[PDB]
Amino acid sequence: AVQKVVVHPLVLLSVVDHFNRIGKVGNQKRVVGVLLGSWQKKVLDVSNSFAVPFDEDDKDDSVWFLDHDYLENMYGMFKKVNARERIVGWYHTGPKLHKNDIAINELMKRYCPNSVLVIIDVKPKDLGLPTEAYISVEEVHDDGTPTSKTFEHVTSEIGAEEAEEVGVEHLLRDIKDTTVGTLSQRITNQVHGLKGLNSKLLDIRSYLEKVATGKLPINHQIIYQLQDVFNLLPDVSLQEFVKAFYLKTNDQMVVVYLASLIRSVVALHNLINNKIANRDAEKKEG
Amino acid sequence: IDAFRLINANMMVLGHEPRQTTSNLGHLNKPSIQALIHGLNRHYYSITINYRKNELEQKMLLNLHKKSWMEGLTLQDYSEHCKHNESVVKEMLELAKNYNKAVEEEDKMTPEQLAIKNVGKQDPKRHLEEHVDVLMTSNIVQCLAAMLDTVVFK
Amino acid sequence: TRPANHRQLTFEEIAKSAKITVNEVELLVMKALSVGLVKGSIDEVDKRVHMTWVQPRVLDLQQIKGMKDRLEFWCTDVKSMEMLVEHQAHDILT
Amino acid sequence: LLKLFTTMELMRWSTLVEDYGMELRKGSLESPATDVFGSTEEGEKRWKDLKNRVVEHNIRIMAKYYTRITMKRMAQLLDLSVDESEAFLSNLVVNKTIFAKVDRLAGIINFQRPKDPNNLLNDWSQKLNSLMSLVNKTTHLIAKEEMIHNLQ
Amino acid sequence: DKKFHGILDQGEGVLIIFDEPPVDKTYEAALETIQNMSKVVDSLYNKAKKLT
């Protein structure tokens, strides 16, 4: 059971270039490569990657090629230049995963047993998702379902490292916004923080429309049982939470009589100091 | 980072780096003295380096490395926050008392020279409203997050 | 049946629907708190039983339909009142 | 020992008496129950102490599961008088081992913690932060299950 | 004599025990700055009266 993966920011980048290498002839719309990583704890780390010649045909949709021979020797070279690094899994792109991914994963679990795949989105780069990591489990299946492979979820993030954030800050130099700017910046944090509140809402909007309609089979295990836990706790009971709002008056009180008065009086000093310096330099000009 | 490139011995009594009609040579570095004490400039030459900055990489590195979704409307709520509002006002009271002291002083001891002989990294306007701005921004972001959360959720 | 609208249930509703006597509704709810399928509390001067409930189970497609309508009211409250904030604070946004 | 685990194992002292008619009379060997409780004067001090231990057991579980409790119902749930109930709650609260505070012109006592403004309001933000975080983990999870089955 | 936190009633003959908030330190130091702000405005108007 893997806790989470850590995206070193060289690997994604090194997927973008190889999608751009074949992209002059790119019509396969998918690039499989090998995900190198550093196994630390239950938490996982990723440091490097490389590619592999890959083909696939939708006709009979099981005809494909990793190259074991290319995977042995080139990883052997990265082992020689760096003994710290080993394989932890693989990756592909083209955000809709395809039916073959059971076959690639169950093949190369004989290189690392708890292997893990990461889907990146090279063309989608817009709203809320950097990557995603999948994992395989095989229990009986459930209380009452037929057995299968069933790609499961591992939560993901983007990590960093000292002496690579230097390459982050120096290569961008574009907008260079700090979190400070507490009037302008924090309000916009509340703005687009709420623009994802309806974005996750419109996603949970669309899911129960197409399962109440009844197209896809209802996941009786987690897909609403975790929502059954969810839908009881926006507590808004009034007549004691109404009495939260003299603390609102208390938070107001420091703003009103302290910050409006002193800011006005200090700028009033700048009037008399200027009106003296105006005319006493005017009467001494002649 | 800097990139260099060796010169020959054919122009050794002549001016090396045979550069010509351009004006982008004076930038990107002057020859530094920790570098020109060695083989610069009669052994190689220095060259100019810029970056091939591209789109389809720049924003996906920016937005994906520094990002937090639900952080923008958290609270850090009140027991850590009313204590901070408690603290800052107390020395600001004495800062106001020190602000009174210079204003009621107001002597013609050549007051631009009286201010330079009374330098203390202190009151007049520097140790002023700087705190008041922090008291303003902290309570506004605290109360705007408080009012929006009552609005949205039920 | 009432999803936390006014979840402070009165004792007579339990004593009628469970058809148990009035004096044993307290021993009945202390057992359900002892098992752990509910985490409420008991008042006795008013004999109203306050409810906080964390136990999930199946919810029988018809209750998705009512969950859709509550999610749609949840939609236009978030959507329209964000348009209020953005149009008000547009010039300091950038 | 199972009956004195936790959560009242729903109990009653008169039922404990009817479970313990055997401690004087019958059993496999029966002898320490006659030695500990069946004795005349050393048993009777242990008789009042076993009554004291079970009422001490019932005060803690009432503090767990009750906001308020009337005076008459506590007396019938402790199988003794209202005044002896007043004496039992007095020497426990001056022992500061059970937090309680009574109101005996009307008889209603309460087990509430002493309310304060910010901590109640500290609770609303905590339920809120747990709410907003969980729907993010929810929507992240339903986006995956949508993604897997759409491919089949 | 402040040895106690309470109040009495004659309509019911009843002693009542309560508590009090010690969190006046914000509002105490709030209006003491107004005394400092009163003195500076009295000083400025004196300075502005001295010369136009």
C81 vs B contacts (CB less than 8 Å): 151-152
Q: In which element (H, E) is residue C63 found?
A: helix C62-88
Looking at chain E, the number of H-run helices and the number of E-run strands are 1, 2
| Helix axis angle, B82-103 to E25-50, nearest 10° | 20
Domain ranges across chain A: 2-182, 223-282
Q: Which residue has the tokens 């009034």?
A: A238
Tokens matching residue D28: 């496999």
**Cβ-Cβ contacts under 8 Å, E47 against chain B:** 106
Grouping H, G, I as helix, E, B as strand and the rest as coil, residue B98 is helix
Rounded distance between C-alpha atoms, residue D3 and residue A80, angstroms: 67
Instruction: Return the SS3 of B22.
Output: coil
Q: What are E16's strand-pairing partners?
A: E7
CA distances from A117 to A64, A112, A114, A122, A138 (A): 17, 12, 10, 16, 17
Of the candidates D138, D147, D148, the beta carbon closest to that of A204 is on D138
For B96-100, the CB contacts below 8 A with 24+ separation are B96/A262, B96/E33, B96/E36, B96/E37, B96/E40, B97/E36, B98/B122, B98/B123, B98/B127, B99/B123, B99/B124, B99/B128, B99/E36, B99/E40, B100/E36, B100/E39, B100/E40, B100/E43
Phi-psi region of A150 (alpha: psi -120 to 50; beta: other; left: phi over 0): left
Q: Using the structure block, give the residue that is written with the tokens 């923008």.
A: B72
Q: How far apart are CA A265 and CA E47, in angstroms?
A: 14
Residue of B nearest to A259 (CA): B132
CA distance B100 to B116: 19
Q: Is A283's Cβ below 8 Å from some Cβ in E? A: no
Token pair for A216: 């896809």
**Which residues of D have a CB under 8 Å from any CB of C?**
6-8, 10, 61, 65-70, 73, 108
User: H/E/C letters for each residue in chain A?
Assistant: CCCEEEECCCCCHHHHHHHHHHHHCCCCCCCCEEEEEEECCCCEEEEEEEECCCCEECCCCCEECCCHHHHHHHHHHHHHHCCCCEEEEEEECCCCCCCCHHHHHHHHHHCCCCCEEEEECCCCCCCCCCEEEEEECCCCCCCCCCCCCCEEEEEEEECCCCCCHHHHHHHHCCCCCCCCCCCHHHHHHHHHHHCCHHHHHHHHHHHHHHHHCCCCCCCCCCCCHHHHHHCCCCCCCHHHHHHHHHHHHHHHHHHHHHHHHHHHHHHHHHHHHHHHHHHHHHCCCC
Q: How far apart are CA E26 and CA B83, in angstroms?
A: 9
In this complex, the residue of C27, C30, C44 whose CB is nearest that of residue D70 is C44
CA B32 to chain C, closest CA, distance in angstroms equals 41
B111 close to B103: Cβ distance less than 8 angstroms: no
Is the minimum CB–CB distance between A18 and chain D shorter than 8 Å?
no
**Chain E residues touching residue D105 (CB < 8 angstroms):** 12, 14
B14, C49, D60 from B4: Cα distances, Å: 20, 81, 81
What span, in angstroms and rounded, lies between the C-alpha atoms of C65 and A89? Answer: 42
- Report the alpha-carbon angle E29-E30-E32, nearest 5: 65
D26 CB-contact burial (10 Å; exposed 0-12 / middle 13-18 / buried 19+): exposed
Helices B130-152 and A184-194 cross at an angle (nearest 10°) of: 10
Contacts of range B144-149, beta carbons closer than 8 Å, 24 or more positions apart? B144/A187, B144/A190, B145/A190, B145/B73, B145/B74, B145/B75, B146/A248, B146/A251, B146/B75, B148/A190, B148/A194, B148/B73, B148/C85, B149/B73, B149/B75, B149/D125, B149/D128
CB contact under 8 Å between A233 and D127, yes or no, is yes
End-to-end CA distance of chain D: 55
E36 chain-B contacts, CB cut-off 8 A = 93, 96-97, 99-100
Q: Give yes or no for a contact between A230 and C3, defined as CB atoms under 8 angstroms apart.
A: no
**CA dihedral of A177, A180, A186, A191, whole degrees rounded to 10:** 0
**If DSSP codes are grouped into helix, strand and coil, which group holds residue D120?**
helix
* Side chain identity, residue B45: Y
Residues 6 or more apart in contact with residue A165 via CB below 8 angstroms: none
DSSP 8-state secondary structure symbol assigned to residue B127: I
Reduce the DSSP state of residue D128 to 3 states and report it: helix
Quick check: helix, strand or coil at residue D110? strand
Distance from CA of D68 to the nearest CA of A (A): 18
Tokens (6 digits) for A69: 């021979």
Residue among C34, C42, C43 minimizing CB distance to D7: C34
Query: What secondary structure does DSSP assign to B23-85, as a single string?
Result: S-SSSS----HHHHTTTTTTSS-B--------TTTHHHHHHHHS--SGGGG----STTTHHHH
B3–chain A Cβ distance below 8 A for any pair: no
Find the Cα–Cα–Cα–Cα dihedral B152, C1, C5, C8, rounded to 10°.
Answer: -140
Residue A242 tokens, joined: 């109404």
Q: Say whether D114 and E19 touch across the interface (CB within 8 A).
A: yes
Rounded to 10 degrees, the C-alpha dihedral B105/B109/B110/B116 comes to -70
Sign of CA dihedral A8, A13, A15, A18: negative
3-state secondary structure of B7: coil
Strand pairing class (A151-158; A4-7): parallel
The pair phi, psi for residue C74, each rounded to 5°, is -60, -30
Q: Decide if E48 and A272 are in contact by the 8 Å CB cutoff.
A: yes
Contact A197, B152 (CB under 8 A): yes
| Cα–Cα dist A227/A215, whole Å | 19
* Residues A91 and A35 sit within 8 Å (Cβ to Cβ): yes
Nearest CA in chain C to D106: C45
Alpha helical stretches, state H, D28-152: 31-36, 41-65, 71-76, 82-93, 117-151
Long-range contacts of A169-173 (CB under 8 A, 24+ apart): A171/B51, A171/B53, A171/B61, A172/B58, A172/B61, A172/B62
CA distances from C39 to A117, C30, C36, D42, D125 (A): 40, 10, 7, 43, 20
Q: How far apart are CA D57 and CA D78, in angstroms?
A: 10
Query: How many Å lie between the alpha carbon of C54 and the closest alpha carbon of chain D?
Result: 13
Q: Report the C-alpha gap between D86 and D94 in whole angstroms.
A: 12
- Find the largest Cα–Cα distance for chain A: 102
Nearest by CB to residue D128, choosing from B79, B82, B149, is: B149
User: What's the start-to-end Cα distance of chain C, in Å?
Assistant: 47
How was this structure determined? It was done by cryo-EM
- Alpha-carbon gap, residue B63 to A125, rounded angstroms: 9
Asked if D106 is an interface residue toward chain E (Cβ–Cβ < 8 A), one would say: no
Residues closing a segment before a gap in chain E (C–N exceeding 2.5 Å): none
- Residue A210 CA to residue C68 CA, distance in Å, equals 11
Helix (H, G, I), strand (E, B) or coil at E47: helix
What are the beta bridge partners of residue A34? Answer: A50, A90
If one counts every other C-beta atom within 10 angstroms of the C-beta of residue A230, the result is 18
Q: Is the dihedral of CA B18, B20, B25, B30 positive or negative?
A: positive
Cα-atom radius of gyration of chain E, to the nearest Å?
23
Cβ count near C4 (within 10 Å): 17
Q: In what order do the strands lie in the sheet with C41-42?
A: C9-10, C48-50, C41-42
**Are residues B78 and D122, on separate chains, in Cβ contact within 8 Å?**
yes
Chain discontinuities in chain B, listed by preceding residue (C to N exceeding 2.5 Å): none
C47 by DSSP, 3-state: which?
A: coil
CA nearest C78 in B: which residue? B152
> Resolution in A, one decimal?
3.2
